[PDB]
Structure 1
């Protein structure tokens, strides 16, 4: 019937004018009749709203000629084990002016790096969707209250994504021509990738013959891991969801069956480290 993708998380009780509503569902009920919508002169468009739109629920299950896979097979992942980067994200929850979606708070990688982002969301307005800071709270529970100080120590996303590209480039330039993000579950990781990933046809670096791994919005150019200084987007990453390989139970319990040297520090980078670690064991341990 409905999806939560692009759910309106505002607390406004009325709906949208027919000229401003992105969809039939979002039109205010006053305008709906006979399965259609009507224009009502004298009930004009609204010029002041700010409606947080949820980015939870991406579905990357397309087949478009000339565009590569994002999610890859296990066999392809195995071939590209040098490109594996575990990735996990801790989130915070929208509050106050909006409620009902989660924003990336701490992004962690199997390099051991954690980056903290300002709570940021996609806000529909009478004009362009506004990418902006939003009010946020920790997820409910005593075990999350340690996230509270992080909600005041974050970096703006424009800095965060440059740092992600720099980190991946420094890590991978002498290892691989690509990145494979190794995930445990994928929904919130994919939500977080909306903030720092772009996709399209396979491209080549503007400075050499390698495939492009990075994109620059400022210059509209493409670079490989060697030539990406200043670039802000990861371009055509690959990824695989380890949780889908038949496991029951949570990440730590499955990781700990194989490995005793990654004690759980309860932080995104540690989840990312355990995810890549579990993936290596599951794919390569001979049985």
Structure 2
């Protein structure tokens, strides 16, 4: 039994040296014997590798005292409808030095904003994990053609995450003490949140009594939506996957049952607007 979380997407045929492999599975077969591993004199460590590690497959089903749930029930989401922000991400695929994982390319929100990121991944090396630009291409197909020019219009993730925090703060500071990302088929949205979300126990802002919604790696401080200028991470967001409410077909077919004003313009922000709109019609209309 294995998971795809942290799958090694490199094209290297062999596994790793026992001192460098993060796990027993990742150790090369040559070192495995008698249920464990052995050091083999004369077989050296690899001092130049770059192995892309997949961030697909997170499971946020922990229950730890003092840490809030990220995924919330439909009833809780309804009470916080003012905090709803639809969110969708269009990805690009790892290619060349790696294959088998999706990287965020166009991040779209129900505010109508689309942010484009440089294709970036988590590359294990002999010394650390290097969060860095990786070779990528849009998926093939006429439905993904619009992503082609975006491959060269991306911003570095350190800039994209500041822009996400600023956009959420401007939109929500007078509406809610939190954010609820409204999702449809959440897997890749949760993988994308690894790039701009941090979690921990519930905290208060550095300048007031409000709960903290943002975190700054510059000072290791917390802020609410009013005091987050310059902050780079979204802290303790909430989320709900609308697809889990009993729908059968795709997003657009279900959205179109209640709504006609949101035509599909085929872009992350449009999918984010359709997702929030469908959730609003399902929970509050008629």
Q: Is the pair's TM-score, using the shorter chain for normalization, greater than 0.5?
A: yes
Q: How does 1:234-249 map onto structure 2 within 5 Å?
A: 234-249=234-249
Deviation at 1:146, TM superposition (A): 2.2
CA distances 1:71-123 after superposition (whole Å, capped 9, x unpaired) = 00111000000000000000000000000000000000000000000000000
**Is residue 265 of structure 1 aligned with residue 265 of structure 2?**
yes
Q: How does 1:187-198 map onto structure 2 within 5 Å?
A: 187-198=187-198
Q: Give the TM-score normalised by the residue count of structure 1.
A: 0.99
Deviation at 1:142, TM superposition (A): 2.4
CA distances 1:153-181 after superposition (whole Å, capped 9, x unpaired) = 00000000000000000000000000000
Deviation at 1:53, TM superposition (A): 0.2
CA distances 1:197-241 after superposition (whole Å, capped 9, x unpaired) = 000000000001100000000110000000000000000000000
Aligned positions, number = 286
CA distances 1:239-287 after superposition (whole Å, capped 9, x unpaired) = 000000000000000000000000000000000000000000111123x
Cα RMSD for the two superposed structures: 0.6
- Unaligned residue ranges in structure 1 (runs of 5+): none
Higher deviation after alignment, 166-175 or 31-40: 31-40
Query: Which residue is equivalent to 2:141?
Result: 141
d(CA) in 2 for partners of 1:180, 1:146: 28
d(CA) in 1 for partners of 2:116, 2:44: 41
Query: Which residue is equivalent to 1:38?
Result: 38
d(CA) in 2 for partners of 1:143, 1:107: 17
Q: Secondary structure at the match of 1:69?
A: coil
d(CA) in 2 for partners of 1:143, 1:206: 45
Deviation at 1:134, TM superposition (A): 0.3
CA distances 1:28-65 after superposition (whole Å, capped 9, x unpaired) = 01000122100111112111000000000000111001
d(CA) in 2 for partners of 1:146, 1:83: 30
Q: Give the TM-score normalised by the residue count of structure 2.
A: 0.99
d(CA) in 1 for partners of 2:232, 2:69: 21
Structure 1: which 4+ aligned runs deviate by more than 4 Å? Answer: none
